[PDB]
Amino acid sequence: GPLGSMVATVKRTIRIKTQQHILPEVPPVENFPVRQWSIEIVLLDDEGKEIPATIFDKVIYHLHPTFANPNRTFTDPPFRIEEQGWGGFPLDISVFLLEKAGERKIPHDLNFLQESYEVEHVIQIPLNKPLLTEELAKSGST
């Protein structure tokens, strides 16, 4: 299964939730409509119900470099970001575990394929920081 230091971890599923719609008052860019889009992040428990992702004390969205100040930091669940843009792009979402337990770079794809869509990612989380272990208890076994 896992090996070495990675044995002392548990897995959680986080769900990234994306929404987007066209802003008609914003002029299209080269005929492409400008859309308002939003990303949020939740945690899933052992039953698959959505609970606040309190296991992170910080989330940073690393946006495409066409945005001003493309690295956007949020500290409260659900770490909701909102922007306007003309194009889809892969972006990295850095999530920072409580108690400096570690940064995880989760691959997201911002796209306009649907009005809304959800994507799940499995992350490994260590069990050696008491406050994080205690918080992890709310979303499933540890």
Partner: peptide, 7 residues
């Protein structure tokens, strides 16, 4: 809906 940027 398939509009995308570069990298």
């Amino acid at each position: 809906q398939t509009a995308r940027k570069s990298t």
